[PDB]
Structure 1
Amino acid sequence: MVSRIEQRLIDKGLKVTDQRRVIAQVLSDSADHPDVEEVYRRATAKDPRISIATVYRTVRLFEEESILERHDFGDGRARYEEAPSEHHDHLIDVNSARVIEFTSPEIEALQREIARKHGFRLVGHRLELYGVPL
């Protein structure tokens, strides 16, 4: 098969050039929330004709198309992942910038109830935990 991101591109009728295929594959493979520079090093290592400008343009395309989600965990560094098929939040090692995903149905339910008590429906939220190793 083609990468998950390539398939999403086909679904939306966007052109799949050689270089876009490489970038889509890099991003589908990655689960570590790479920044644009990291996507670039991975992509250009596969196809050396890929420039950082093309990676910027391609990541913007994916973000515009809701294929990628972007995070800034505090340090102003944009980090990217596929639109997850399951909601999760993030715990970040403040020393190494390692990101861990977690889900807490209990917190999700508590958030929605807090919104309800205040007369609101929740349309979005951001939960980030900042940690140092025990």
Structure 2
Amino acid sequence: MVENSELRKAGLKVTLPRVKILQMLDSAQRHMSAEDVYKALMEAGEDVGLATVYRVLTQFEAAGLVVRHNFDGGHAVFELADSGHHDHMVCVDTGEVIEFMDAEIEKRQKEIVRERGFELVDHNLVLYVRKKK
């Protein structure tokens, strides 16, 4: 299965809890907390406890299958890494998260780093915003 390959490529043994959580992440909320995953699983009548959900998502994060972000300061969001790249705009007053991808900034980041003798390994860009209105 595709999930099995993803887990193996990530140096992680294939297990039922690991497969169900990855499937939950695949189907979307784009930015889910550990509780959102747990609640979705419980709705689906599954049998995975919250602590296990958090543990697995942390295993996925360390492995590179997911990225963990904290946009409102008070909770962690976990989202797949495999998906197309996206940086984020966060509405400070409401907590609304808006993904974006600007090719100009992406190429400028590469230029900045390369002209210094480096290679860009990863990056994080968050723009905190408020409606002009």
Q: Same fold (TM over 0.5)?
A: yes
Deviation at 1:48?
4.6
Number of residue equivalences: 130
- After TM superposition, the score normalised by the length of structure 2 is 0.79
Summarize deviations over 1:56-106 as a string: whole Å, max 9, x none: 121122123211111122514211111134222111122222221111111
Judged with a 3 Å threshold, the aligned counterparts in structure 2 of structure 1 residues 31 and 38 are, in CA distance, closer, same or farther, namely: closer
1:49 to 35, 47, 50: 47
Letter in 1 for 2:18: R
Distance in 2 separating the partners of 1:89 and 1:7: 27
In structure 1, runs of 5+ residues without a counterpart are none
In structure 2, runs of 5+ residues without a counterpart are none
Q: Per residue, is there more strand in 1 or in 2? A: 1
Percent of paired sites with the same residue: 35
C-alpha RMSD of matched pairs (Å): 2.4
Contact 2:90/2:129, CA 8 A, preserved across alignment: yes
Letter in 1 for 2:95: A
Contact 1:33/1:80, CA 8 A, preserved across alignment: yes
Distance in 2 separating the partners of 1:47 and 1:21: 15
Runs of 4 or more, structure 1, over 6 Å off, are none
